[PDB]
mmCIF file of C-alpha atoms and ligand atoms in Angstrom:
data_model
loop_
_atom_site.group_PDB
_atom_site.id
_atom_site.type_symbol
_atom_site.label_atom_id
_atom_site.label_comp_id
_atom_site.label_asym_id
_atom_site.label_seq_id
_atom_site.Cartn_x
_atom_site.Cartn_y
_atom_site.Cartn_z
ATOM 1 C CA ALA H 1 0.000 0.000 0.000
ATOM 2 C CA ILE H 2 1.369 3.374 -1.018
ATOM 3 C CA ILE H 3 1.295 5.949 1.804
ATOM 4 C CA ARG H 4 -0.056 9.455 1.617
ATOM 5 C CA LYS H 5 1.414 11.570 4.270
ATOM 6 C CA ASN H 6 1.234 15.005 5.692
ATOM 7 C CA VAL H 7 3.205 17.292 3.398
ATOM 8 C CA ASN H 8 5.016 18.693 6.374
ATOM 9 C CA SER H 9 6.248 15.311 7.516
ATOM 10 C CA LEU H 10 8.000 14.633 4.192
ATOM 11 C CA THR H 11 11.686 13.731 4.279
ATOM 12 C CA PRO H 12 14.075 15.588 1.876
ATOM 13 C CA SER H 13 14.359 12.395 -0.179
ATOM 14 C CA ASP H 14 10.552 12.099 -0.295
ATOM 15 C CA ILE H 15 10.423 15.654 -1.636
ATOM 16 C CA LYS H 16 13.140 15.078 -4.197
ATOM 17 C CA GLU H 17 11.566 11.845 -5.525
ATOM 18 C CA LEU H 18 8.162 13.581 -5.736
ATOM 19 C CA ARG H 19 9.505 16.593 -7.520
ATOM 20 C CA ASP H 20 11.353 14.307 -9.905
ATOM 21 C CA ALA H 21 8.511 11.871 -10.536
ATOM 22 C CA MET H 22 6.264 14.926 -11.069
ATOM 23 C CA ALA H 23 8.656 16.490 -13.574
ATOM 24 C CA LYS H 24 8.568 13.254 -15.573
ATOM 25 C CA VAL H 25 4.787 12.953 -15.443
ATOM 26 C CA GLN H 26 4.589 16.544 -16.675
ATOM 27 C CA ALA H 27 6.906 15.839 -19.621
ATOM 28 C CA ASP H 28 5.102 12.622 -20.533
ATOM 29 C CA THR H 29 2.815 13.087 -23.624
ATOM 30 C CA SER H 30 1.045 9.741 -23.332
ATOM 31 C CA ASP H 31 -2.449 9.132 -21.971
ATOM 32 C CA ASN H 32 -0.855 8.709 -18.578
ATOM 33 C CA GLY H 33 0.899 12.030 -18.645
ATOM 34 C CA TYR H 34 -0.097 15.172 -16.786
ATOM 35 C CA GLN H 35 -2.028 17.069 -19.512
ATOM 36 C CA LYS H 36 -4.148 14.022 -20.227
ATOM 37 C CA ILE H 37 -4.997 13.290 -16.614
ATOM 38 C CA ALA H 38 -5.613 16.976 -15.807
ATOM 39 C CA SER H 39 -8.089 17.007 -18.754
ATOM 40 C CA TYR H 40 -10.372 14.560 -16.978
ATOM 41 C CA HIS H 41 -11.493 17.473 -14.792
ATOM 42 C CA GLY H 42 -12.351 20.516 -16.882
ATOM 43 C CA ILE H 43 -10.838 21.640 -20.193
ATOM 44 C CA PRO H 44 -10.261 20.314 -22.649
ATOM 45 C CA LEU H 45 -13.836 19.001 -22.178
ATOM 46 C CA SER H 46 -13.532 15.219 -22.165
ATOM 47 C CA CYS H 47 -17.125 14.064 -21.769
ATOM 48 C CA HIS H 48 -20.021 14.111 -24.227
ATOM 49 C CA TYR H 49 -23.749 14.193 -24.096
ATOM 50 C CA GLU H 50 -25.742 11.750 -26.294
ATOM 51 C CA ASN H 51 -25.997 14.587 -28.764
ATOM 52 C CA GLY H 52 -22.295 15.191 -29.150
ATOM 53 C CA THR H 53 -22.129 18.238 -26.985
ATOM 54 C CA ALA H 54 -19.192 18.165 -24.576
ATOM 55 C CA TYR H 55 -19.072 18.977 -20.899
ATOM 56 C CA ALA H 56 -16.405 18.964 -18.147
ATOM 57 C CA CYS H 57 -16.251 15.530 -16.623
ATOM 58 C CA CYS H 58 -15.820 16.426 -13.000
ATOM 59 C CA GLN H 59 -18.787 15.700 -10.800
ATOM 60 C CA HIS H 60 -19.600 18.571 -8.434
ATOM 61 C CA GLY H 61 -22.894 19.485 -6.739
ATOM 62 C CA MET H 62 -23.786 15.814 -6.423
ATOM 63 C CA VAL H 63 -23.313 12.945 -4.004
ATOM 64 C CA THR H 64 -20.639 11.308 -6.178
ATOM 65 C CA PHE H 65 -18.271 14.256 -5.936
ATOM 66 C CA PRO H 66 -16.045 12.504 -3.335
ATOM 67 C CA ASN H 67 -16.046 9.284 -5.380
ATOM 68 C CA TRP H 68 -15.226 10.940 -8.683
ATOM 69 C CA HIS H 69 -12.375 12.961 -7.172
ATOM 70 C CA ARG H 70 -11.050 9.958 -5.203
ATOM 71 C CA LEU H 71 -10.429 8.223 -8.562
ATOM 72 C CA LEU H 72 -8.885 11.326 -10.210
ATOM 73 C CA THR H 73 -6.402 11.757 -7.338
ATOM 74 C CA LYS H 74 -5.579 8.041 -7.597
ATOM 75 C CA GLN H 75 -5.121 8.383 -11.383
ATOM 76 C CA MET H 76 -2.485 11.077 -10.828
ATOM 77 C CA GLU H 77 -0.915 9.142 -7.987
ATOM 78 C CA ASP H 78 -0.349 5.958 -10.025
ATOM 79 C CA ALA H 79 1.343 7.994 -12.763
ATOM 80 C CA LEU H 80 3.810 9.498 -10.244
ATOM 81 C CA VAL H 81 4.551 6.170 -8.686
ATOM 82 C CA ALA H 82 5.118 4.863 -12.178
ATOM 83 C CA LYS H 83 7.684 7.618 -12.767
ATOM 84 C CA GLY H 84 9.583 6.668 -9.669
ATOM 85 C CA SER H 85 7.705 8.111 -6.688
ATOM 86 C CA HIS H 86 7.987 5.790 -3.705
ATOM 87 C CA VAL H 87 5.450 7.848 -1.779
ATOM 88 C CA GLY H 88 1.836 8.777 -2.515
ATOM 89 C CA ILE H 89 0.383 12.241 -3.202
ATOM 90 C CA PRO H 90 0.940 13.974 0.138
ATOM 91 C CA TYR H 91 -1.988 15.822 1.731
ATOM 92 C CA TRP H 92 -2.049 19.490 2.598
ATOM 93 C CA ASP H 93 -4.016 19.580 5.856
ATOM 94 C CA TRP H 94 -5.718 22.940 5.316
ATOM 95 C CA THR H 95 -8.149 22.617 8.262
ATOM 96 C CA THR H 96 -5.076 23.301 10.418
ATOM 97 C CA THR H 97 -4.136 26.971 10.657
ATOM 98 C CA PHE H 98 -1.442 28.021 8.183
ATOM 99 C CA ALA H 99 0.124 31.398 7.473
ATOM 100 C CA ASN H 100 1.227 30.353 3.993
ATOM 101 C CA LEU H 101 0.891 27.723 1.315
ATOM 102 C CA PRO H 102 3.172 24.730 1.866
ATOM 103 C CA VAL H 103 6.835 25.168 0.789
ATOM 104 C CA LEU H 104 6.527 22.184 -1.515
ATOM 105 C CA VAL H 105 4.461 24.292 -3.921
ATOM 106 C CA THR H 106 5.905 27.781 -3.276
ATOM 107 C CA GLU H 107 9.617 27.256 -4.102
ATOM 108 C CA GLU H 108 10.170 28.761 -7.544
ATOM 109 C CA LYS H 109 13.444 27.104 -8.487
ATOM 110 C CA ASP H 110 13.411 23.625 -9.962
ATOM 111 C CA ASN H 111 10.073 22.749 -8.446
ATOM 112 C CA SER H 112 7.591 20.800 -10.547
ATOM 113 C CA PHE H 113 4.843 21.626 -7.971
ATOM 114 C CA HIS H 114 5.185 25.403 -8.371
ATOM 115 C CA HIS H 115 3.107 25.398 -11.555
ATOM 116 C CA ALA H 116 2.273 23.431 -14.645
ATOM 117 C CA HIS H 117 1.829 24.416 -18.232
ATOM 118 C CA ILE H 118 -1.613 24.284 -19.765
ATOM 119 C CA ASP H 119 -0.974 23.166 -23.331
ATOM 120 C CA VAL H 120 -4.477 23.897 -24.519
ATOM 121 C CA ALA H 121 -4.277 27.481 -23.180
ATOM 122 C CA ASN H 122 -0.619 28.014 -23.941
ATOM 123 C CA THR H 123 0.155 29.427 -20.477
ATOM 124 C CA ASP H 124 1.218 28.293 -17.031
ATOM 125 C CA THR H 125 -1.177 28.000 -14.124
ATOM 126 C CA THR H 126 -1.771 31.005 -11.839
ATOM 127 C CA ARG H 127 -2.434 31.485 -8.097
ATOM 128 C CA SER H 128 -3.519 34.747 -6.409
ATOM 129 C CA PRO H 129 -4.340 33.867 -2.770
ATOM 130 C CA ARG H 130 -7.056 35.961 -1.202
ATOM 131 C CA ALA H 131 -6.422 37.304 2.277
ATOM 132 C CA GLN H 132 -9.290 35.172 3.703
ATOM 133 C CA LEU H 133 -7.198 32.071 3.125
ATOM 134 C CA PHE H 134 -4.809 32.976 5.998
ATOM 135 C CA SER H 143 -9.938 28.295 12.069
ATOM 136 C CA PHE H 144 -12.748 28.851 9.574
ATOM 137 C CA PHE H 145 -12.056 25.630 7.720
ATOM 138 C CA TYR H 146 -11.911 23.572 10.867
ATOM 139 C CA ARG H 147 -15.491 24.755 11.666
ATOM 140 C CA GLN H 148 -16.866 24.059 8.200
ATOM 141 C CA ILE H 149 -15.329 20.590 8.258
ATOM 142 C CA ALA H 150 -16.347 19.715 11.815
ATOM 143 C CA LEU H 151 -19.998 20.350 10.829
ATOM 144 C CA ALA H 152 -19.550 17.923 7.949
ATOM 145 C CA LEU H 153 -17.952 15.298 10.170
ATOM 146 C CA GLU H 154 -20.789 15.614 12.702
ATOM 147 C CA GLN H 155 -23.255 14.246 10.083
ATOM 148 C CA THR H 156 -24.143 10.542 10.210
ATOM 149 C CA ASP H 157 -25.578 10.226 6.746
ATOM 150 C CA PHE H 158 -23.413 10.261 3.551
ATOM 151 C CA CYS H 159 -25.533 12.763 1.668
ATOM 152 C CA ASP H 160 -25.716 15.190 4.571
ATOM 153 C CA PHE H 161 -21.921 14.893 5.063
ATOM 154 C CA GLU H 162 -21.197 15.191 1.344
ATOM 155 C CA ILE H 163 -22.813 18.621 0.894
ATOM 156 C CA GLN H 164 -21.021 20.221 3.906
ATOM 157 C CA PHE H 165 -17.754 18.542 2.902
ATOM 158 C CA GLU H 166 -17.936 19.607 -0.768
ATOM 159 C CA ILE H 167 -18.861 23.242 -0.078
ATOM 160 C CA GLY H 168 -16.097 23.431 2.517
ATOM 161 C CA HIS H 169 -13.516 22.087 0.030
ATOM 162 C CA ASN H 170 -14.664 24.656 -2.558
ATOM 163 C CA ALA H 171 -13.281 27.447 -0.340
ATOM 164 C CA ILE H 172 -9.692 26.380 -0.868
ATOM 165 C CA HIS H 173 -10.234 26.474 -4.615
ATOM 166 C CA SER H 174 -11.665 29.941 -4.563
ATOM 167 C CA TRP H 175 -9.259 31.638 -2.139
ATOM 168 C CA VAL H 176 -6.119 30.123 -3.612
ATOM 169 C CA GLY H 177 -6.958 30.818 -7.262
ATOM 170 C CA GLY H 178 -8.668 34.085 -6.555
ATOM 171 C CA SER H 179 -9.352 36.142 -9.652
ATOM 172 C CA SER H 180 -6.387 34.671 -11.488
ATOM 173 C CA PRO H 181 -7.477 33.414 -14.935
ATOM 174 C CA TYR H 182 -5.886 29.951 -14.885
ATOM 175 C CA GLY H 183 -5.886 28.880 -11.292
ATOM 176 C CA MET H 184 -7.648 26.935 -8.572
ATOM 177 C CA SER H 185 -10.860 29.010 -8.705
ATOM 178 C CA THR H 186 -11.896 27.970 -12.177
ATOM 179 C CA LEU H 187 -13.515 24.636 -12.863
ATOM 180 C CA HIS H 188 -11.699 24.754 -16.218
ATOM 181 C CA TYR H 189 -8.135 25.006 -15.018
ATOM 182 C CA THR H 190 -7.979 23.850 -11.414
ATOM 183 C CA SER H 191 -6.639 20.411 -12.154
ATOM 184 C CA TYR H 192 -3.488 21.890 -13.702
ATOM 185 C CA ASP H 193 -2.159 23.530 -10.571
ATOM 186 C CA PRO H 194 -0.117 20.863 -8.754
ATOM 187 C CA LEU H 195 -1.553 22.236 -5.473
ATOM 188 C CA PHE H 196 -4.880 20.803 -6.649
ATOM 189 C CA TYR H 197 -3.553 17.327 -5.898
ATOM 190 C CA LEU H 198 -2.319 18.183 -2.397
ATOM 191 C CA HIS H 199 -5.754 19.766 -1.774
ATOM 192 C CA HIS H 200 -7.536 16.739 -3.120
ATOM 193 C CA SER H 201 -5.472 14.243 -1.270
ATOM 194 C CA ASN H 202 -6.464 16.168 1.893
ATOM 195 C CA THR H 203 -10.069 16.264 0.751
ATOM 196 C CA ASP H 204 -9.914 12.463 0.244
ATOM 197 C CA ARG H 205 -8.414 12.228 3.691
ATOM 198 C CA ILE H 206 -11.360 14.124 5.234
ATOM 199 C CA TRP H 207 -13.734 11.683 3.607
ATOM 200 C CA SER H 208 -11.568 8.834 5.002
ATOM 201 C CA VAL H 209 -11.666 10.272 8.545
ATOM 202 C CA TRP H 210 -15.485 10.330 8.179
ATOM 203 C CA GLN H 211 -15.625 6.651 7.094
ATOM 204 C CA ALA H 212 -13.608 5.736 10.193
ATOM 205 C CA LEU H 213 -16.020 7.788 12.403
ATOM 206 C CA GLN H 214 -18.979 5.978 10.913
ATOM 207 C CA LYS H 215 -17.298 2.655 11.479
ATOM 208 C CA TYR H 216 -16.668 3.724 15.043
ATOM 209 C CA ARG H 217 -20.318 4.823 15.277
ATOM 210 C CA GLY H 218 -21.600 1.522 13.987
ATOM 211 C CA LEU H 219 -23.095 3.258 10.942
ATOM 212 C CA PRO H 220 -22.653 2.490 7.216
ATOM 213 C CA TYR H 221 -19.349 3.750 5.864
ATOM 214 C CA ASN H 222 -18.790 1.766 2.614
ATOM 215 C CA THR H 223 -22.312 2.135 1.282
ATOM 216 C CA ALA H 224 -24.916 4.899 1.350
ATOM 217 C CA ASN H 225 -28.709 4.472 1.460
ATOM 218 C CA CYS H 226 -29.341 7.982 0.199
ATOM 219 C CA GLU H 227 -29.399 8.815 -3.498
ATOM 220 C CA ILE H 228 -29.016 5.037 -4.239
ATOM 221 C CA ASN H 229 -29.474 5.749 -7.944
ATOM 222 C CA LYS H 230 -26.494 7.968 -8.692
ATOM 223 C CA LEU H 231 -24.144 5.640 -6.834
ATOM 224 C CA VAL H 232 -24.505 2.860 -9.394
ATOM 225 C CA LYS H 233 -23.911 4.836 -12.548
ATOM 226 C CA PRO H 234 -20.369 4.968 -14.015
ATOM 227 C CA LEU H 235 -17.953 7.780 -13.222
ATOM 228 C CA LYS H 236 -16.991 9.101 -16.674
ATOM 229 C CA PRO H 237 -14.324 8.973 -18.017
ATOM 230 C CA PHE H 238 -12.764 6.376 -15.650
ATOM 231 C CA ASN H 239 -15.056 3.685 -16.964
ATOM 232 C CA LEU H 240 -13.901 4.036 -20.581
ATOM 233 C CA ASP H 241 -11.733 1.427 -22.316
ATOM 234 C CA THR H 242 -9.378 4.302 -23.116
ATOM 235 C CA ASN H 243 -8.597 4.718 -19.403
ATOM 236 C CA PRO H 244 -5.021 3.286 -19.143
ATOM 237 C CA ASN H 245 -5.451 2.753 -15.437
ATOM 238 C CA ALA H 246 -6.912 -0.670 -14.657
ATOM 239 C CA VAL H 247 -7.520 0.107 -11.010
ATOM 240 C CA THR H 248 -9.540 3.264 -11.497
ATOM 241 C CA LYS H 249 -11.355 1.612 -14.346
ATOM 242 C CA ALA H 250 -12.212 -1.366 -12.142
ATOM 243 C CA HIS H 251 -13.721 0.897 -9.424
ATOM 244 C CA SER H 252 -15.429 3.343 -11.740
ATOM 245 C CA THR H 253 -18.882 3.444 -10.186
ATOM 246 C CA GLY H 254 -19.859 5.338 -7.100
ATOM 247 C CA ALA H 255 -20.744 2.035 -5.528
ATOM 248 C CA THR H 256 -17.259 0.643 -6.128
ATOM 249 C CA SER H 257 -15.259 3.671 -4.976
ATOM 250 C CA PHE H 258 -16.086 3.739 -1.269
ATOM 251 C CA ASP H 259 -13.335 1.369 -0.255
ATOM 252 C CA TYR H 260 -10.032 3.195 -0.721
ATOM 253 C CA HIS H 261 -8.091 0.264 0.696
ATOM 254 C CA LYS H 262 -8.953 -1.494 -2.540
ATOM 255 C CA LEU H 263 -7.328 1.381 -4.385
ATOM 256 C CA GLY H 264 -3.900 0.574 -3.020
ATOM 257 C CA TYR H 265 -3.136 3.540 -0.793
ATOM 258 C CA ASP H 266 -3.394 4.560 2.825
ATOM 259 C CA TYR H 267 -2.740 7.634 4.972
ATOM 260 C CA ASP H 268 -0.019 8.077 7.534
ATOM 261 C CA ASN H 269 -2.928 8.440 10.003
ATOM 262 C CA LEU H 270 -6.545 9.573 10.363
ATOM 263 C CA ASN H 271 -5.983 11.782 13.379
ATOM 264 C CA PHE H 272 -8.126 14.840 12.780
ATOM 265 C CA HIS H 273 -6.546 17.811 14.497
ATOM 266 C CA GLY H 274 -4.408 15.691 16.759
ATOM 267 C CA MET H 275 -7.432 13.748 18.024
ATOM 268 C CA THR H 276 -7.870 10.013 17.674
ATOM 269 C CA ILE H 277 -11.063 8.777 16.037
ATOM 270 C CA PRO H 278 -12.790 8.127 19.354
ATOM 271 C CA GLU H 279 -11.625 11.512 20.709
ATOM 272 C CA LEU H 280 -13.060 13.339 17.685
ATOM 273 C CA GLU H 281 -16.420 11.598 18.148
ATOM 274 C CA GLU H 282 -16.526 12.670 21.829
ATOM 275 C CA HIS H 283 -15.629 16.187 20.647
ATOM 276 C CA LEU H 284 -18.344 16.419 17.990
ATOM 277 C CA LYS H 285 -20.908 15.197 20.513
ATOM 278 C CA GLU H 286 -20.024 18.037 22.892
ATOM 279 C CA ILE H 287 -21.009 20.369 20.046
ATOM 280 C CA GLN H 288 -24.519 18.931 19.836
ATOM 281 C CA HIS H 289 -25.066 19.516 23.519
ATOM 282 C CA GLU H 290 -25.690 23.176 22.593
ATOM 283 C CA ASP H 291 -28.807 24.510 20.858
ATOM 284 C CA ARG H 292 -27.872 26.009 17.491
ATOM 285 C CA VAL H 293 -29.649 28.078 14.878
ATOM 286 C CA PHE H 294 -28.788 27.452 11.234
ATOM 287 C CA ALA H 295 -29.181 29.339 7.970
ATOM 288 C CA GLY H 296 -29.902 26.759 5.287
ATOM 289 C CA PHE H 297 -29.272 27.242 1.541
ATOM 290 C CA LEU H 298 -30.658 25.480 -1.543
ATOM 291 C CA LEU H 299 -27.874 25.447 -4.155
ATOM 292 C CA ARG H 300 -27.878 24.698 -7.890
ATOM 293 C CA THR H 301 -25.689 25.384 -10.968
ATOM 294 C CA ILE H 302 -25.057 28.987 -11.815
ATOM 295 C CA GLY H 303 -22.633 28.267 -14.696
ATOM 296 C CA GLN H 304 -19.690 29.915 -12.949
ATOM 297 C CA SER H 305 -17.709 30.068 -9.684
ATOM 298 C CA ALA H 306 -19.040 32.426 -7.006
ATOM 299 C CA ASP H 307 -18.453 33.489 -3.431
ATOM 300 C CA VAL H 308 -21.487 34.086 -1.221
ATOM 301 C CA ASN H 309 -21.406 36.388 1.834
ATOM 302 C CA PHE H 310 -24.337 37.165 4.085
ATOM 303 C CA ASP H 311 -25.180 39.152 7.126
ATOM 304 C CA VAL H 312 -27.710 38.613 9.870
ATOM 305 C CA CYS H 313 -29.800 41.779 10.487
ATOM 306 C CA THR H 314 -32.173 42.830 13.228
ATOM 307 C CA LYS H 315 -35.303 44.400 11.745
ATOM 308 C CA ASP H 316 -34.079 47.897 12.650
ATOM 309 C CA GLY H 317 -31.181 47.363 10.244
ATOM 310 C CA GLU H 318 -28.394 46.507 12.651
ATOM 311 C CA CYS H 319 -26.279 43.756 11.046
ATOM 312 C CA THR H 320 -23.403 41.450 11.723
ATOM 313 C CA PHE H 321 -21.421 39.092 9.503
ATOM 314 C CA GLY H 322 -23.128 35.768 9.046
ATOM 315 C CA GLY H 323 -20.861 33.659 6.878
ATOM 316 C CA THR H 324 -19.207 32.780 3.580
ATOM 317 C CA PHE H 325 -19.349 29.784 1.296
ATOM 318 C CA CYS H 326 -18.097 29.193 -2.217
ATOM 319 C CA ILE H 327 -19.336 27.551 -5.381
ATOM 320 C CA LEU H 328 -16.876 26.094 -7.930
ATOM 321 C CA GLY H 329 -18.104 26.143 -11.467
ATOM 322 C CA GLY H 330 -17.764 27.223 -15.043
ATOM 323 C CA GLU H 331 -19.256 27.172 -18.483
ATOM 324 C CA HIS H 332 -20.054 23.661 -19.806
ATOM 325 C CA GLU H 333 -20.309 22.162 -16.315
ATOM 326 C CA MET H 334 -22.939 19.459 -16.090
ATOM 327 C CA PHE H 335 -26.256 20.437 -14.496
ATOM 328 C CA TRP H 336 -26.383 20.046 -10.746
ATOM 329 C CA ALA H 337 -28.681 20.870 -7.850
ATOM 330 C CA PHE H 338 -28.382 19.535 -4.302
ATOM 331 C CA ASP H 339 -31.402 17.620 -2.921
ATOM 332 C CA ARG H 340 -31.056 19.065 0.584
ATOM 333 C CA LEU H 341 -29.949 22.204 2.393
ATOM 334 C CA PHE H 342 -26.442 23.391 2.865
ATOM 335 C CA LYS H 343 -26.297 24.292 6.573
ATOM 336 C CA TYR H 344 -24.410 27.209 8.062
ATOM 337 C CA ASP H 345 -24.374 27.754 11.854
ATOM 338 C CA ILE H 346 -25.410 31.325 12.807
ATOM 339 C CA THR H 347 -25.883 30.886 16.557
ATOM 340 C CA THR H 348 -23.102 33.447 17.181
ATOM 341 C CA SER H 349 -24.432 36.210 14.926
ATOM 342 C CA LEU H 350 -27.774 35.972 16.627
ATOM 343 C CA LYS H 351 -26.202 36.114 20.105
ATOM 344 C CA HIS H 352 -24.296 39.126 18.878
ATOM 345 C CA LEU H 353 -27.332 41.087 17.676
ATOM 346 C CA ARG H 354 -28.888 39.802 20.868
ATOM 347 C CA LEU H 355 -31.544 38.066 18.775
ATOM 348 C CA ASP H 356 -33.631 35.131 19.928
ATOM 349 C CA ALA H 357 -34.417 32.215 17.632
ATOM 350 C CA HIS H 358 -37.987 33.401 17.379
ATOM 351 C CA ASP H 359 -37.225 37.063 16.878
ATOM 352 C CA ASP H 360 -37.833 38.345 13.412
ATOM 353 C CA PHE H 361 -34.581 39.124 11.556
ATOM 354 C CA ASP H 362 -33.245 39.145 8.013
ATOM 355 C CA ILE H 363 -30.396 37.398 6.245
ATOM 356 C CA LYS H 364 -28.801 39.640 3.599
ATOM 357 C CA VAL H 365 -27.065 37.798 0.793
ATOM 358 C CA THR H 366 -24.494 39.040 -1.689
ATOM 359 C CA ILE H 367 -23.289 36.757 -4.502
ATOM 360 C CA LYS H 368 -20.061 37.772 -6.206
ATOM 361 C CA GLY H 369 -18.236 36.411 -9.248
ATOM 362 C CA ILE H 370 -14.531 35.588 -8.886
ATOM 363 C CA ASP H 371 -13.660 38.773 -10.722
ATOM 364 C CA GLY H 372 -15.579 40.856 -8.182
ATOM 365 C CA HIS H 373 -18.848 41.517 -9.953
ATOM 366 C CA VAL H 374 -22.046 41.159 -8.014
ATOM 367 C CA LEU H 375 -24.269 38.446 -9.480
ATOM 368 C CA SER H 376 -28.075 38.568 -9.331
ATOM 369 C CA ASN H 377 -29.678 37.380 -6.118
ATOM 370 C CA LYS H 378 -31.882 35.376 -8.433
ATOM 371 C CA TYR H 379 -29.315 32.565 -8.568
ATOM 372 C CA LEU H 380 -30.021 31.650 -4.982
ATOM 373 C CA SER H 381 -33.387 31.127 -3.301
ATOM 374 C CA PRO H 382 -33.807 32.876 0.057
ATOM 375 C CA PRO H 383 -32.246 30.969 2.956
ATOM 376 C CA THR H 384 -34.234 29.139 5.621
ATOM 377 C CA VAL H 385 -33.585 29.433 9.320
ATOM 378 C CA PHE H 386 -34.119 26.512 11.650
ATOM 379 C CA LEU H 387 -33.282 25.542 15.160
ATOM 380 C CA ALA H 388 -31.244 22.474 16.096
ATOM 381 C CA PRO H 389 -31.857 21.809 19.831
ATOM 382 C CA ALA H 390 -29.345 20.213 22.181
HETATM 383 O O1 MAN P 1 -40.017 36.904 -4.968
HETATM 384 C C1 MAN P 1 -38.610 37.082 -5.302
HETATM 385 C C2 MAN P 1 -38.248 36.374 -6.643
HETATM 386 O O2 MAN P 1 -37.960 37.429 -7.645
HETATM 387 C C3 MAN P 1 -37.646 36.911 -8.983
HETATM 388 C C4 MAN P 1 -36.538 35.858 -8.905
HETATM 389 O O3 MAN P 1 -35.363 36.530 -8.437
HETATM 390 C C5 MAN P 1 -36.911 34.723 -7.899
HETATM 391 O O4 MAN P 1 -35.862 33.732 -7.850
HETATM 392 C C6 MAN P 1 -37.053 35.434 -6.513
HETATM 393 O O5 MAN P 1 -37.163 34.486 -5.430
HETATM 394 O O1 CUO P 2 -13.044 19.299 -7.149
HETATM 395 CU CU1 CUO P 2 -13.363 19.333 -9.102
HETATM 396 O O2 CUO P 2 -12.487 20.405 -7.753
HETATM 397 CU CU2 CUO P 2 -12.043 20.214 -5.938
#
């Protein structure tokens, strides 16, 4: 089993072999090279509708998002191992406070992880970190981990992961914030290895809880359909092709890799479960959002306001998207805890108050409030 470890626990030899194996994968023009694998995600569009119209293959806004991306990260991993890496794609634990992106990707000189070229666009990838990036993520992820149903976890998990994409890429034209070019920035793989790790920590929690972790009773339909393009005969990877259905991608152990550990924030699995329980011993009020495709990436900010017009910051969540993305709409609410904002405005759950929403494109332009239905507010008692 190939090990994925914390980027900051990498030995200098680990780093060198990774940088080397990555340089070779990037130079490789075969179907197992970088440009080809990166294409599975956005552009060049590699999937087609029955009518010949193409769309980006990555599954977002749906329950199979973890599954689809678990296979894509594995596809890139196998290629690196094949070029000499003796270690798996390391994970960048972004739920842990950080004052800067990991060194692995920031060193400019002779670093294959600093950027990649985008053949189709004839440029290199771009990053333009937003100040918000530098905890918030711990909170967004802990709410996801608290869930005991796959579909409820998935939505919190996916929206939380979107934030890294948006705040790293920023307004840059070819970076992490575009559905089209994210997969080209090598940081995408450190981000997605961590994202796969978060799903793995959740599967261990469920196991610990005595609840289903390798199957899901919700959305039972989508989990049996194939994950394009991993199911195609043209997929040179026999492992990802063999586990190309949502149903077959739950068990990562069958994918040949493992993590150095599943200790979320220094806590063991049973400690984390005790911790999340403590959280539910408090009454909480939540804003709930119904999300669907808007054909682009957007950041949403909202304030909680007393009727008299006194407001306080409510929260922020991001949507990763772009032109030609496949249609998507979640079948449940995305929950955001606003207990604090209320307490601040000295509001009571039953007081009448407003939630003011502002949707903004990645460039900075305000998008119509028409894209999003008005949020719901509900109480979640101890
Ligand atoms: O009643 C408000 C209504 O106005 C119009 C559209 O923006 C709808 O989506 C919105 O909910
Ligand atoms: O998933 Cu397609 O991007 Cu993180």
